[PDB]
Design a protein around this ligand. Structure first.
Ligand SMILES: [Mg+2]
Ligand SMILES: [Mg+2]
Ligand SMILES: [Mg+2]
Ligand SMILES: [Mg+2]
Ligand SMILES: [Mg+2]
Ligand SMILES: [Mg+2]
Ligand SMILES: [Mg+2]
Ligand SMILES: [Mg+2]
Ligand SMILES: [Mg+2]
Ligand SMILES: [Mg+2]
Ligand SMILES: [Mg+2]
Ligand SMILES: [Mg+2]
Ligand SMILES: [Mg+2]
Ligand SMILES: [Mg+2]
Ligand SMILES: [Mg+2]
Ligand SMILES: [Mg+2]
Ligand SMILES: [Mg+2]
Ligand SMILES: [Mg+2]
Ligand SMILES: [Mg+2]
Ligand SMILES: [Mg+2]
Ligand SMILES: [Mg+2]
Ligand SMILES: [Mg+2]
Ligand SMILES: [Mg+2]
Ligand SMILES: [Zn+2]
Lengths: 31, 155, 102, 57, 69, 50
RNA sequence: AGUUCUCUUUUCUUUGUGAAGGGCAGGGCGCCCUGGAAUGGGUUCGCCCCGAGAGAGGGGCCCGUGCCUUGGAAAGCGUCGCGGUUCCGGCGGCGUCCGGUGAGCUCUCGCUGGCCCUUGAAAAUCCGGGGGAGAGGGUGUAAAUCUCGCGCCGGGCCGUACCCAUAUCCGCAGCAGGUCUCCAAGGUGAACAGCCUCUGGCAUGUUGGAACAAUGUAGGUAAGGGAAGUCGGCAAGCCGGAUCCGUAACUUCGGGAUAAGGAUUGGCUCUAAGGGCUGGCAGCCGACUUAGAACUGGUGCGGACCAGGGGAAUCCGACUGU
RNA sequence: CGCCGUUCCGAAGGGACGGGCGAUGGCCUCCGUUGCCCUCAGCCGAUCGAAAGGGAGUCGGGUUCAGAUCCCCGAAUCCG
């Protein structure tokens, strides 16, 4: 597994600041 | 969610500290329902659990300074805290010298540059602190041979 | 003897996000030989570019990881390191790939 | 660097708790407990200081 | 583990009543024939591929033979 | 400790089994007075003494 | 894998092989054979060794925890990539490489020495030797016998979790106390000192918020003076490392002694000296030291940390120890 | 009640190669076993006393929510 995904996933979580109260339970929607 | 169990299992499976376990903050629900090392191994394979890299401790700074010190920098009177003996013990200095000089005598005797009688005389002088270093001993042997040859010629 | 290495930029170039000729030019003046990056040691290192594959050959010791060091440097100068990745395809080649996002 | 632990409940550095380091196929360093050093027989003459030859120690 | 040097002794080993199975491991440089007897795992290392094939077809019957991959 | 005698490991086992709450059907018994196990012990508050 | 505005062939991580058997390095020998040594020789850091047999040759034995090999690549690990029920010891590609160095630290083996009006366990248990009471068969399908190589069967009982300590133990408690050990990275440095950092760990020690009065507790600074304070220099302060020089009274001649007292200390660029391997020379390697010089900065340089104030006397007790 | 004492005021050995007499047995052939006798016999102190002293012999890999040098896989070893 690529170690760059730690950063990419970490930055994605930071974006939850703008969607408080409606944060996705799972971003791997498929399945 | 409370992922204390998953942090502990992943750490064991990765053979790292709990501080190097990275759980995906977007997938806590997925990671939350993994109560076995089998399922943790799956999440490690999937990429929801990753081992973070070691924190960098670079030796470049000290490697750079070690090069400077080899040239004599940062080694003056103002950069010494132990004694001359604590920094470089006299006994080690003497031990190296005797081995160096006794090794030379053995090779000169073996190679017949000197005889066992000259060797014995020089061995006890070497032990007597007559000769400071390899060269001083070698030049002295050269003078001895010249005189010995001159005496032989007349005889 | 001879040492031969290749860089495979096929995936990006066929996506038209890097001019392989420019990359060949970049390795032309930047590759160092005993500290100098001008003359390639005097032709002692030779560069050949194919359609999408760049090749490097040398008559003196040459580090394969140097090409990864320079490839990553070139990718950064062109703002690509956040999308592309240099991965060893074989013992003698690297290739550029895409991170798994979306 | 990797640091070691005893593999037994004897936590003291007694004569029967001596060890040596061993790298394993799993690529780690572990303690192996050494056997005591045997001594070759002493001559029955009681005079010669050395031990005998041709006998396992 | 014991190492056997000659095909003559390995065949005697493989015929022992307490010999259980013969595992053949093929490496890049040699073919190793290992027979699991009661006490030891005897091994024969053959560097010639033709002899390894020849020895393989000349094992005693009734002995479990396994090729490792 | 880990090093234990059979006699001690058996005394400790009996002290383990007595450390439970009363069954709740004991309450409905006809002439019952017990409200709870008044002989509960905690490893930290009070020590077995052996 | 990180950095890449500039520079950095850069920085970080990682880069296995168990027991037991065999083979071989290496280390040790107060072990043997030849021989007979003064123009005495051999030899260590020191020693020490020889006509009761040295040097020099040729052997033998002991330990071999080191390397190769069977183990064993099939496992493990690193990385890349595919599947699956997807809670598979899942499946494949590549790799697991080559050298150097050290008064380095930790352990261990060995050699040799010093100290004692101190001489530094016992037993279970195992083994060799001396002896030769005996037994074995009459030339064989040979016997007694075997500490050799294989093969066969078994190894019952009790303990085993976890804490092991600024919260699992003792102090009435999650108590700044007490409580026996093992392993032990980089830098600076004499250093297991102090100061910073990696691995690993933690959340500030049974609460938070806002203020910044007095009096505290703990740290600092202070013009001029410098003990005038006080029972008393209590407290604080000065000195401090290292290099070079220099060092009194007295003395039980060992000391006193870091006496006392001075100078120096950074950074940078150089010079000289101090070795090993191979074939008074040539070549290739190398590891830290010492000394000297130029240049240089607003005289600042043991720049933090670490780190003795000193002298002249009197009383008591020799001292170290309690 | 007990205490002193631990080899000291003790007939302190229940053992053995071998041999001889019987009683039994079994792969009844000839070998076991057993009882008695003969012969031989220092240890001289019952017993307790150490999870750091003495004391044969197990290592690698995997595996759990929590156990593993103990489970599984592999390879060994000591003792009887
Ligand atoms: Mg001295
Ligand atoms: Mg022998
Ligand atoms: Mg308590
Ligand atoms: Mg001799
Ligand atoms: Mg080894
Ligand atoms: Mg492999
Ligand atoms: Mg005899
Ligand atoms: Mg435990
Ligand atoms: Mg605080
Ligand atoms: Mg707090
Ligand atoms: Mg507390
Ligand atoms: Mg003032
Ligand atoms: Mg002033
Ligand atoms: Mg006054
Ligand atoms: Mg006054
Ligand atoms: Mg004071
Ligand atoms: Mg004085
Ligand atoms: Mg006194
Ligand atoms: Mg006392
Ligand atoms: Mg006992
Ligand atoms: Mg014991
Ligand atoms: Mg013991
Ligand atoms: Mg077992
Ligand atoms: Zn003798």
């Amino acid at each position: 597994v690529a170690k760059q995904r730690i950063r990419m996933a970490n930055e994605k979580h930071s974006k939850n600041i703008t969607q408080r109260g409606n944060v996705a339970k799972t971003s791997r929607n498929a399945p | 969610s409370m992922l204390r169990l998953q942090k502990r299992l992943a750490s064991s499976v990765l053979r790292c500290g709990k501080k190097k376990v990275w759980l995906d903050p977007n997938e806590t629900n997925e990671i939350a329902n993994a109560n076995s090392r089998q399922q943790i191994r799956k999440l490690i394979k999937d990429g929801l659990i990753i081992r973070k890299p070691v924190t960098v401790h670079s030796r470049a700074r000290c490697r750079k300074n070690t090069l400077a010190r080899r040239k004599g920098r940062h080694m003056g009177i103002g950069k010494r805290k132990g004694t001359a003996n604590a920094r470089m013990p006299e006994k080690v200095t003497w031990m190296r010298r005797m081995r160096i000089l006794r090794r030379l005598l053995r090779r000169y005797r073996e190679s017949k540059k000197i005889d066992r009688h000259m060797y014995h005389s020089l061995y006890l002088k070497v032990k007597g602190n007559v000769f400071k270093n390899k060269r001083i001993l070698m030049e002295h042997i050269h003078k001895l041979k010249a005189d010995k040859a001159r005496k032989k010629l007349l005889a | 003897q001879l040492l031969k290495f290749t860089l495979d930029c096929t995936h990006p170039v066929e996506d038209g996000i890097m001019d392989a000729a420019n990359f060949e030019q970049f390795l032309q003046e930047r590759i160092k030989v005993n500290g100098k990056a001008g003359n390639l040691g005097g032709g002692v290192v030779s560069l050949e570019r194919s359609k999408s594959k760049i090749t490097v050959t040398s008559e003196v010791p040459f580090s394969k990881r140097y090409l990864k060091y320079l490839t990553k440097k070139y990718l950064k100068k062109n703002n690509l390191r956040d999308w592309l990745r240099v991965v060893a395809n074989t013992k003698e080649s690297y290739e550029l790939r895409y991170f798994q996002i979306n | 660097v990797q640091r070691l632990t005893y593999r037994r409940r004897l936590s003291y550095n007694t004569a029967s708790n001596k060890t040596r380091l061993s790298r394993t196929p799993g690529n780690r360093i572990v303690y192996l407990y050494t056997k005591k050093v045997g001594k070759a027989p002493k001559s029955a003459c009681g005079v010669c200081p050395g031990r005998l030859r041709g006998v396992r120690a | 583990p014991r190492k056997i040097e000659e095909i003559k002794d390995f065949l005697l080993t493989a015929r022992r009543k307490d010999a259980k199975s013969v595992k053949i491991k093929k490496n890049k440089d040699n073919v190793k024939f290992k027979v699991r007897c009661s006490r030891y795992l005897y091994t024969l290392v053959i560097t010639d591929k033709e002899k390894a094939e020849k020895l393989k077809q000349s094992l005693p019957p009734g002995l479990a033979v396994k090729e490792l991959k | 400790s880990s090093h234990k005698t059979f006699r001690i490991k058996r005394f400790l086992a009996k002290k383990q089994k007595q450390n439970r709450p009363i069954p709740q059907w004991i309450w409905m018994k006809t002439g019952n007075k017990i409200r709870y196990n008044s002989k509960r012990r905690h490893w930290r508050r009070t020590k077995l003494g052996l």
